[PDB]
Design a protein around this ligand. Structure first.
Ligand SMILES: Nc1nc2cc[nH]c2c(=O)[nH]1
Ligand SMILES: [Zn+2]
Ligand SMILES: [Zn+2]
Lengths: 390, 382
RNA sequence: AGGUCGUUAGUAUAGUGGUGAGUAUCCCCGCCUGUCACGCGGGAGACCGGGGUUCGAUUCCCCGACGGCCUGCCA
């Protein structure tokens, strides 16, 4: 029983446009999903977020299993009841803590041992335990624990990680207990090596999984390797199931990768960058602490539609950010989430009515001005698939 | 201005002002509070969440200390301050310094006063003060005064006499300067009364200030330790005897629920509303009841304890705020211990609503004249 | 009127006749890709004015200004 239905597919490139059929309503692909780790979005009530338009949200396993712990969260009727959110949820496997908290833990074939970064206590996280606590949380898409290595390391470490991830995959498949209510997503590993990633694809395509996801591609690395790796991954994967690219969040990346056949995205950039005082716009961003925005009586963006871009001007936000009142950090957050949601919808409608190749030209023109000044890593990716601008 | 007095029983005035604002079309009840703001908005709230609060009053309260820095901008905007901060539908009152952060003593001279802003300390003469008032265009504004004597709690009579004379000079000068101009003529100006802890001064100040066409009065310097709460309560009833009975009375520094019920008894109209902010910033949640008909026992609960970790209940039964409709105590404890921002929002939305409810109830009860029962109910707890 | 005390970044406070004048806040740049994050680095910014004493003056003496306190005058 498939979970994805196709609606419209570009006849010039490989972009798609469809819809997911999840246990709490349905979502139109592509989609961007913001992330709130400790069972909240930072600084903003759920009614605001729901009214902005968003339809699926995130969570984390390590943190929630640490404090407050599985036992009472299960007694609070899962993370839907605990957080009070009537839409779809997606729960991460805690494998990213294996690269973020690198100098605080060790890993063996049995699991991983973590020393808490809030008080130095150590405990064990093995595939069975991770899958169990995720079963207690009760999400709509559940991810398998994998042995993540950094995308900046070499040596036989990558092969060990790949094979160990496969073995853990089979263990956690055997450990899964609610096959009907959750969708386990195999995670493709292999770093940046062609042969290793090909082997991984070939091997773990044979298992029965609802979906597939592409991992190990985040942070700082050459983009020339990045897009080639995504293009390799997309062709081998089947067409009846969604792809999923983890940890890409900027606008240019979203559009290019849509052209290359992705379906879902995740990042923490917009929310976190809001709390440092910066806003997102069709031309980049604004830093509302400089002196240049002190006497500027217009809106943030004339064409926007968020609650912030209709009442308040730039001058007022500048002046309010300089006090101790934190309400000025709950304005930027709303704008950035709205910004992100509108762009995906625009692209989707552009492709449904058979005009997608002309959306891209306009977007590049707006962002960089002359369409001949886009990043050289975007021209190659676009020209490979058929879309030619300039 | 138009004052109504439906009932005056046992020295407890009840009424409503009906002609105020631009030219009318606004009514304000008595007694009441004013919404407390930091540099524009309510603290931790934006307009969307602010309008989820029931029973927000119609007049707010700016502080000259917070807005004095951004002065060269409002002249360029040219159109007032309810339009700059995007609240263009309420009256405004511009007090001088906020009650939460006290002003250290020992800077007032016979030419200017001082106020403590974020960028530091700034002193202002008469001309600067009038220019700022012209630019802001608020409905009301308290005149430039001298109140440095509250800090000492004990001093020679010479300082107190000097203070009273200073304040009189300031009032006269500003009255003339405002009379001269044009734009300022549509804003009301209110008077200030002081004198320390002497009956003579507390009488002379009031007698001498009543003979000017100011539109209302301010009673300054009536807070202190609970060991002097009779010598700081007879003086008040002696003071409110030399003022015309047609203008509002304001009192600064009194916001606890227990002192208010006795400050109203000597005749007082309007109050600040900063106490719920204090009880929120400390991490607690107000829980005393004021329903008379049906911190010792319950005045606030502390939520960083351990007993509130497997507790699935609202903060207060029957509270109608957003927090008490959606979330539970466990979740707020989890938010507090793990150091989250949303905790402030969810607690402010509750504390403000509770306090406003209290003031509405006390006004209604005073209308029905059953203040003794409510006074006993409040006193038996804190 | 007379007597006495005081003056150091935009705004507070330590310090010395031989110190890059210390600290905390403002001001100015940079960083952010499924949260160790209302965060992390870096920079800039002062001894009231005048005269004398001293090898050397923010450090000792004299004058002026500004301000507080006391007395006198006055209420
Ligand atoms: N589990 C998991 N999470 C993330 C988040 C970003 N990258 C990864 C990855 O490779 N694995
Ligand atoms: Zn907007
Ligand atoms: Zn409540």
């Amino acid at each position: 029983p498939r979970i994805m239905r196709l609606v419209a597919e570009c006849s010039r490139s490989r972009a798609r446009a469809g819809e997911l059929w999840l246990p709490h309503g349905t979502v139109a692909t592509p989609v961007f999903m913001p992330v709130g780790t400790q069972a909240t979005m930072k600084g903003i009530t759920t009614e605001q977020l729901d009214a902005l338009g968003c339809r699926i949200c995130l969570g984390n396993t390590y943190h929630l299993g640490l404090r407050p712990g599985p036992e009472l969260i299960q007694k609070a009727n899962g993370l839907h009841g605990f957080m009070n959110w009537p839409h779809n949820l997606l729960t991460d496997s805690g494998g990213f803590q294996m690269v973020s908290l690198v100098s605080l833990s060790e890993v063996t074939e049995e699991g991983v041992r973590f020393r808490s970064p809030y008080d130095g206590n150590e405990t064990l996280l093995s595939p069975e335990k991770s899958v169990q606590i995720q079963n207690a949380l009760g999400s709509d898409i559940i991810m398998q624990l994998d042995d993540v290595v950094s995308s900046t390391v070499t040596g036989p470490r990558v092969e060990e990680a790949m094979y160990r991830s496969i073995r853990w995959l089979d263990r956690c498949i055997a450990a899964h207990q609610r096959p009907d209510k959750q969708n386990l997503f195999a995670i493709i590993q292999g770093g940046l090596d062609a042969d290793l990633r090909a082997t991984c694809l070939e091997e773990m395509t044979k298992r029965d999984v609802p979906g597939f996801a592409i991992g190990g591609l985040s942070g700082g690395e050459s983009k020339s390797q990045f897009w080639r790796m995504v293009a390799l991954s997309t062709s081998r994967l089947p067409k009846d199931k969604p792809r999923y690219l983890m940890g890409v969040g900027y606008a240019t990346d979203l559009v290019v990768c849509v052209a290359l056949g992705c379906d879902m995205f995740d990042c923490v950039f917009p929310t976190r960058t809001a709390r440092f005082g910066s806003a997102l716009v069709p031309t980049g961003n604004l830093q509302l602490r400089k002196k240049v925005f002190e006497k500027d009586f217009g809106p943030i963006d004339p064409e926007c539609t968020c609650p912030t871009c209709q009442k308040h001007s730039r001058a007022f936000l500048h002046a309010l950010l300089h006090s101790d009142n934190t309400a000025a950090l709950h304005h930027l957050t709303v704008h950035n989430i709205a910004y992100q949601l509108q762009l995906m919808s625009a692209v989707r409608t552009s492709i449904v009515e058979k005009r997608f190749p002309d959306f891209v030209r306009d977007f590049m023109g707006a962002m960089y001005g002359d369409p001949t000044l886009c990043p050289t890593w975007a021209t190659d990716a676009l020209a490979s698939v058929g879309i030619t601008l300039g | 201005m138009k004052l109504s007095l439906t009932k005056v029983v046992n020295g407890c005035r009840l009424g409503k002002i009906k002609n105020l604002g631009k030219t009318g079309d606004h009514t304000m009840d008595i007694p009441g509070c004013l919404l407390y703001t930091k540099t524009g908005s309510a603290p931790h709230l934006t307009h969307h969440t602010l309008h989820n609060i029931h029973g927000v009053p119609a007049m707010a309260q700016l502080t000259l200390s917070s807005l004095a820095e951004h002065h060269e901008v409002l002249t360029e905007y040219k159109e007032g301050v309810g339009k700059f901060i995007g609240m263009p539908e309420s009256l405004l009152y511009c007090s001088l310094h906020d009650p939460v952060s006290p002003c250290p003593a020992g800077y007032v001279t016979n030419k200017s006063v001082s106020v403590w802003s974020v960028a530091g300390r700034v002193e202002m003469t008469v001309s600067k003060f009038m220019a700022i008032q012209k630019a802001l265009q608020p409905d009301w504004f308290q005149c430039l005064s001298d109140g440095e004597v509250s800090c000492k709690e004990a001093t020679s009579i010479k300082r107190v006499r000097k203070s009273v004379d200073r304040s009189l000079l300031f009032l006269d000068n500003c009255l003339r300067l405002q009379e001269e101009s044009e734009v300022l003529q549509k804003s009301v100006i209110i008077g200030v009364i002081e004198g320390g802890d002497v009956m003579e001064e507390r009488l002379r100040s009031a007698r001498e200030t009543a003979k000017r066409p100011v539109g209302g009065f301010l009673l300054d310097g009536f807070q202190g330790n609970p060991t002097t709460l009779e010598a700081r309560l007879r003086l008040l009833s002696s003071v409110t005897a030399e003022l015309p009975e047609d203008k509002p009375r304001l009192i600064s520094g009194v916001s606890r629920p227990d002192e208010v019920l006795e400050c109203i008894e000597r005749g007082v109209d309007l109050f600040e509303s900063f106490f719920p902010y204090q009880v929120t910033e400390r991490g607690c949640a107000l829980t005393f009841s004021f329903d008379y008909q049906p911190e010792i026992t319950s005045f606030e609960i502390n939520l960083k304890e351990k007993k509130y970790q497997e507790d699935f209940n609202p903060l207060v039964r029957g509270c109608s705020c957003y927090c008490c409709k959606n979330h539970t105590r466990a979740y707020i404890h989890h938010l507090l211990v793990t150091n989250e921002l949303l905790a402030g929002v969810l607690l402010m939305m509750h504390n403000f609503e509770h306090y406003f409810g209290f003031f509405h109830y006390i006004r209604e009860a005073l209308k029905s004249d059953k203040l003794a029962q409510l006074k006993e109910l409040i006193h038996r707890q804190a």
